[PDB]
Point group: D2
Chain length 430, copies 4
């Protein structure tokens, strides 16, 4: 076992850091004063443009597919550096990565060449979105006997017809509400959308992914694709993840990502398992920003006393707890993404490790930001410090990318209950 970073991993860090410090630090003056989420997202477009120019979207796509992604550990180091400075734009890049993952993972090389083209060009501001989440919730989307996804699709001729609503998926409506450049829309196949999901058939066997582009939306009637709203978020105030309604929305058969059923559900689960692992890097960045701000403050401020506050044991204890949470978190992320890259390990081992990672890093990042605030004291509550923004941003992580309580813990639980469960297969082999 080895924890040393290669020259390309150190360069990936230096590059990410330089981009964050020279480009992302300027985003706040653009977005900070806009009234609504969409406006804030739009104000972020020149920074995404720069990220594309710096190669950061091309770096979300594997080299075999014409991108420049070197590894998932490189990706982890990049995301930690970006999120330690500014989640604006950084969040857009990862949302796009998620949006691309089903195509990156699928088994059609002609689909990959066609739909990944804009994202490896190094030009423009192309957005992708994995459109899974819904107004009524998704924690129970695979539950045999329940209503399932309320976004359904039916084959009519040589096309599919989507009806229903999505809520929350990042970048889904694009910069201007005429659509992401690529959206992977996750649907439940229902030949008749009025009738409930058949409780005698496993929900996983009825999943289909349909690829929707700006062209697709332009080819439909205006009322077939409507953005009904844009949630105002506590933190990550510059992301877009709207309420979208498809009404009789036609999509050509060639845009069907794969065979409906277990293969499609598989692509989705895989994409979301990879995000589960990497989301820990974002939480680390946010929490690391809080720790470092509190640390510098505790090593330079006496708070009207005779020594720097880090010399009070209760202050150092908080800082120690923060530092520990960050160190364990990062190791767990690097373990997770490395596990995901291991061809030897069966999927359930990868999936359990990804779930653990998401659950731990996100929950623990919140504690880290709060302890940092408690250590700095009253000054952390004013907006001339970063903590108000970090507090709001950090609370997103346990909730999003599949919340810990409803999705990730239950995905991990299902794995642990299986008869052939091997708790240590990722470490000690099978």
């Amino acid at each position: 076992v080895d924890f040393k970073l290669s020259p390309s991993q150190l360069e990936a860090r230096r590059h990410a850091q330089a981009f964050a410090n020279t480009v992302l630090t300027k985003a706040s003056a653009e977005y900070s004063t806009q009234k609504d989420q969409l406006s804030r997202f739009q104000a972020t477009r020149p920074f995404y443009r720069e990220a594309v120019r710096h190669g950061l979207i091309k770096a979300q796509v594997p080299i075999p597919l014409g991108g420049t992604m070197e590894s998932l550990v490189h990706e982890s180091i990049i995301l930690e550096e970006l999120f330690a400075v500014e989640p604006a734009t950084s969040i857009t890049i990862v949302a796009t990565a998620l949006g691309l993952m089903p195509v990156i993972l699928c088994d059609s090389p002609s689909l990959q060449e066609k739909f990944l083209k804009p994202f490896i060009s190094g030009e423009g501001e192309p957005l992708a979105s994995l459109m899974h989440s819904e107004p009524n919730g998704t924690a129970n989307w695979l539950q045999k006997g329940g209503p399932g996804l309320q976004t359904t699709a039916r084959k009519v001729g040589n096309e599919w017809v989507i009806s229903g609503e999505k809520l929350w998926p990042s970048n889904s409506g694009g910069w201007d509400y005429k659509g992401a450049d690529l959206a992977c829309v996750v649907c439940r196949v229902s030949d008749d959308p009025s009738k409930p999901q058949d409780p005698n058939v496993d929900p996983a066997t009825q999943i289909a992914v349909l690829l929707v582009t700006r062209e697709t939306i332009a080819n439909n009637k205006k009322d077939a694709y409507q953005i009904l709203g844009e949630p105002e978020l506590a933190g990550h105030i510059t992301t877009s993840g709207p309420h979208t309604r498809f009404t009789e929305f036609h999509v050509p058969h060639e845009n069907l990502l794969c065979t409906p059923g277990l293969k499609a559900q598989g692509l989705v689960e895989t994409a979301f398992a990879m995000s589960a692992a990497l989301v820990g890097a974002m939480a680390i960045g946010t929490a690391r920003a809080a720790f470092e701000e509190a640390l510098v403050f505790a090593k330079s401020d006496t708070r009207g006393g005779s020594k720097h506050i880090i010399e009070h044991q209760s202050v150092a204890d908080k800082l120690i707890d923060c530092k520990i949470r960050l160190e364990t978190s990062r190791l767990l992320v690097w373990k997770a993404v490395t596990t995901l890259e291991d061809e030897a390990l069966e999927w359930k081992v990868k999936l359990e490790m990804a779930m653990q990672t998401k659950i731990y890093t996100t929950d623990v990042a919140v504690e880290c930001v709060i302890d940092a605030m408690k250590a700095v004291g009253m000054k952390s509550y004013a907006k001339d410090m970063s903590f108000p923004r970090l507090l709001n941003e950090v609370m997103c992580y346990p909730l999003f990318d599949g919340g810990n309580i409803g999705l990730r813990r239950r995905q991990m639980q299902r794995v642990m209950a299986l008869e052939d469960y091997e708790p240590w297969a990722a470490t000690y082999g099978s």
Copy 2:
């Protein structure tokens, strides 16, 4: 022993609830459109006006002093109901209460009659502020051999001259920055403010409290009293707690609250111990709003599954944990205020109980809000629910009113380290 509420405690609660729902619910539509903190505080003036007409400012003063305060348990009940709905204006009421407290507690009936007069009238919108906190911190203000308070006072003729800065004290500038109707300014006596505090004298013997009114301010040169800034807060966005600088600010000797030294420190300690106990009620109201909103959601929503999510054990575990935190918090607050009202008990015992109460309720209220958010899941993160506001608001409580890490834990540690410490004296007697 008994927890039944008297008819007048029940009436205080009905009155508080009616006030909250007829008046305080309208505040948000007024303060929400104001871009800066002072303006938000100013938009809140008509609601404080209504608070005064409803008798709520008069109820912060004991009956023997012309007020209508029935008891601290009545107060605890009122504060919980107000803060469960809207901390805007509610926070102003309690900040005024704290400003009044050094006067309420002092042994001079002439000062009490004079300076409490506007607060017991039922007219206007009179504000009071206890001005203790400073830019450089206050956790170490009584540390022997340290710099001490940087707001100092010196006697010159038949007046005192205040030099230095305060930061954070609620209401201290009034509605218009010409001053609170009553400010208790806490100073360190120093004949020559350019000289450090003398390291061989106990800081507590150099504390003075000087009463500064609007008239005091108007009797000084314009540049003798100035507001340098108004912090933009993460939550409690409608409160004012400015950065104030006194420069050669003259106060009559008749305005000195009491003899400088241990008597003055003692009045500040007592005031802040009473607030330590009652700040729990504010934390309970906020956390209670989060718990109730999560409870109703959990009972009303299936999240696309086969049953309401309260029926999931992980969801119920969060709700159970919130409920336990709230229940234990309320009990401890009522214990602490009843203990403060007990004439048979020594100060050290009351102080220890008040510290415990502040530490427990405020730390635990934060966990209550966060767990509530986790239970609700993603929808908790959007501002169509109340959680974004509650999370920002709840994080104030561990930090303010004497932070838990630097001030309240240290005060309690000091009492616990005394040779005659009796842990259980508030319960089982001495």
Copy 3:
């Protein structure tokens, strides 16, 4: 609302302290030499004798039934003092009180007069046991479609015949394995014990409680009642709670406690709700002993340094956290038992409060003992301090008297999920 203790409550405390210090402190010299659990329990008989002589068993029976119980708050005070010194014998008293409860609370005065008689006499060493728990578990005993209790009973002529096994019920075999003086055996009614519980039935409608005395056991064949074993416990090493098998055990119909079904389940639920509330006083006593030992150590020992260890913030922080856990725990126990006593409150309100109390106090007692050990440090790990015993004893509390995870949380969850659940009914009526 009032927390002040009456003269009789203070006397109850004094009496309980004097008993624990002059009698219970001598127990260890006797049980300590005994190599198995039963023999340790037997070694404890002379101390239970003394407890009876001091009126402590009589104090577990209400005055209208010939006992001397003053109130549940008196009971809480007695238990805290007892368990602060020595859980040996204390645990027998409390287990007997649980065994008496179904008879104390039943609607048959003839059963009360006959079966409580030995317990109000003030003589001998009479034991009672509520025999509910089983080798296969009881967390799911009321699960519809589940196997239910494996101890069943059937009516044959003018008798009931019991088949199956119990495990864990305190005192159940008596001093000599010829039986407790009174055992309430909870059975599921089944005319054929080889047949699985009907999945269509509500399991609570099948419950019967049969009273079994030493004369009942003697009236049966010797192999109809056998003790198969006695668990060797991590702590509470002097308690007995054996593995008992009933094989065609005949009981007179006049020993049926009440109408089978909902009424019988209700008596058991009520007895265990009462124990849920009071078990916190035992947790508090154990945790309090750990806190006070650490506190005395922290204020007298420098650990080879220049100052008492309580002077170190990290140490003081552990002690503060223990103190707060103990203070909140006692308040919650007093609230719970006062709630149970309230004639005007509905059952589910009482039950919910009792569940909260059990969950909180027992979880938090464990943390209190462990934090106290960390504060004292390495010396806490050797048996010349009490912490090794306290750690083993405290870990009983979250697991016993209905475990928190499987029973108490799920009882509380069920009440919260009821359409008419009112969270603050025990405090703010309505």
Copy 4:
């Protein structure tokens, strides 16, 4: 960056597992029948003899020094597997590794060759001990102005004379109270032991380490070396760590480990920093045994319900938290030991990483055992399961090898407060 185990790491694991399962499982049948700590420890001798025969003591010594230690990752894997089964004898091996470390670390090949010889022979049952800890404590041994170590040494011609007492050091009295085969006795140099440590000299400049063998002890008068007692421990009930008194105890100058002062303090600090990282693997072993026992239980028992208990969300939540604690702990240990072996890294970077590791792994192991017990429920409390032993054993870890509260957190705080502290130097370099 890589977590993959080499073939030799996998072989170390297999070999350690086979030794634990074939040899160590048999230990309990021998030590459980003995009446006190010493006897239990003595009953452990044949198992240590087997460990020596299987090369496990030789594997504590680096290959350059004639041992077989392959790497600290190898050692971590071995310790996790040993402590997962049986800490008896396992504890003796690690205590011997600690005892050897000051010699392994020193810069004197002639000392190394002489004193390490029995330990690399593969013969007998040689024991080492690092005798640091004392009756009065050691958390403040380096405190300037404090009393310091109460075990002192004075130079008398060509010999040193030791006065004072040790308490706790494992193996220090050997199998028979005639001494460990090698003890490294840490002393404070003092010409006159009746005089207090000079408050004007930095305690670390007065540290000496004297090597004491069985020959040294036999060459002194009988009353010069006395075992006064053997603590009865809550867990690890088969280790020896006696109370030793040196009275005018003569040691040859050629047995001095190095020049007294910073160099000697540095060997002690380094040895204890290496143990701090590795003790994590012991904590993991114990917690892993709890987790796996709870997991097997939860996957095979319904607890009288219809489904395996792991299907209940609150049970799964506990197992998930245990699993996460174990995964993060192991990563942190492997990171910490790999950091210690990195010659490019400054000592303070290694030290910080080792303290973090000790703090985290030992605190969290306790939580893991307790969670596992709560998940299993009542049955976990009886000695037919492993948990009573594991609970007592896991509580050792945060207290021993320098407790977290008094020692490790203070050592880490000291590093963090340094002006040139680089928090991430172990991951991203300097």
